[PDB]
Amino acid sequence: AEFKAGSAKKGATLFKTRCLQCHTVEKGGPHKVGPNLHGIFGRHSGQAEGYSYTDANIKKNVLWDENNMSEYLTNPKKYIPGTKMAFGGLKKEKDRNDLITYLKKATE
Amino acid sequence: AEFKAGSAKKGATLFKTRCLQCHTVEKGGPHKVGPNLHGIFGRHSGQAEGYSYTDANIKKNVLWDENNMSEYLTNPKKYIPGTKMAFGGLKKEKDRNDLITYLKKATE
Numbered sequence: 001a002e003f004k005a006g007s008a009k010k011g012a013t014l015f016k017t018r019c020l021q022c023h024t025v026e027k028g029g030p031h032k033v034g035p036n037l038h039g040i041f042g043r044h045s046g047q048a049e050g051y052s053y054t055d056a057n058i059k060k061n062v063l064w065d066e067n068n069m070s071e072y073l074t075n076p077k078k079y080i081p082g083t084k085m086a087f088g089g090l091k092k093e094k095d096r097n098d099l100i101t102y103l104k105k106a107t108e
Numbered sequence: 109a110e111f112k113a114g115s116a117k118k119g120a121t122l123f124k125t126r127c128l129q130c131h132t133v134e135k136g137g138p139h140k141v142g143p144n145l146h147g148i149f150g151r152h153s154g155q156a157e158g159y160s161y162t163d164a165n166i167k168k169n170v171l172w173d174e175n176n177m178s179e180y181l182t183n184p185k186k187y188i189p190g191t192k193m194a195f196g197g198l199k200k201e202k203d204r205n206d207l208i209t210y211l212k213k214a215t216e
């Protein structure tokens with residue numbers, strides 16, 4: 001994938017309707033079904049403090065950046081076979097760019 | 109991964125020593141142990157005419173670009189479990205950037 005900066009505003013509404021059910025983004029925010037995502041960019045996968053991951057999410061051990069995040073969110077179980085993130089993917093490149101633009105700022 | 113343009117000149121030497129054994133890049137160049145790589149950027153994985161790929165590589169169905177190429181070359185079998193490309197990987201980021209800088213140009 002090749003991330004290109006998008007709309008944080010549109011990204012925020014995507015997050016609210018496609019991600020929030022399972023994730024929070026704020027520093028010190030709670031784990032839910034999925035891990036709190038504060039500090040996710042620039043950190044290896046499977047390391048949110050206190051969250052119990054699958055073996056696959058741990059073994060992937062990928063340093064999250066805007067490009068491999070875009071690939072992951074296109075199709076999570078293709079990027080991390082054995083994941084337990086029950087999300088099918090964002091099929092539109094503009095959607096991934098908007099979402100990641102928001103997520104970069106929100107999880108900073 | 110986050111590709112950054114590097115040295116095409118150094119990339120050519122890296123391709124000679126690490127890839128050429130199994131790959132050609134020229135338009136109409138032969139398949140060898142590995143597929144000819146002409147036009148690889150902007151092609152989906154496993155789709156070059158006349159080459160017999162693994163199911164793994166076909167199923168990955170990745171649209172090759174500079175960033176996912178960089179993740180791939182770091183560790184091919186980790187990115188595409190089941191691939192028959194016998195290559196340990198380019199562990200140095202500058203080496204991947206140089207190689208991909210060369211490869212983008214050479215496969216046009």
Ligand code: HEC
Binds near residue numbers: 047103
């Ligand atoms: C529940 C139904 C979820 C939805 C909808 C989304 N995610 Fe998720 N995510 C969920 C779980 C249970 C997990 C852990 C999976 C595992 O195998 O252990 C995750 C994981 C992630 C990650 C990786 C986190 C890390 O490596 O530390 C990311 C980056 C992530 N989730 C982001 C994300 C986004 C942006 C979503 C909306 C588009 C989204 N997830 C949906 C659960 C669920």
Ligand code: HEC
Binds near residue numbers: 130141156160164211
């Ligand atoms: C033989 C010993 C190889 C060496 C050295 C390198 N590669 Fe390779 N590669 C090889 C095979 C047998 C295959 C097909 C794998 C399969 O599972 O079918 C490949 C594949 C690639 C690809 C994907 C091609 C496509 O999807 O059409 C790329 C982009 C690629 N190889 C690049 C590449 C580079 C840049 C190398 C040097 C660093 C390199 N390979 C080494 C066999 C061999």
Ligand SMILES: [Cl-]
Binds near residue numbers: 132133134137
């Ligand atoms: Cl050639």
Ligand SMILES: [Cl-]
Binds near residue numbers: 197198199200
């Ligand atoms: Cl190396």
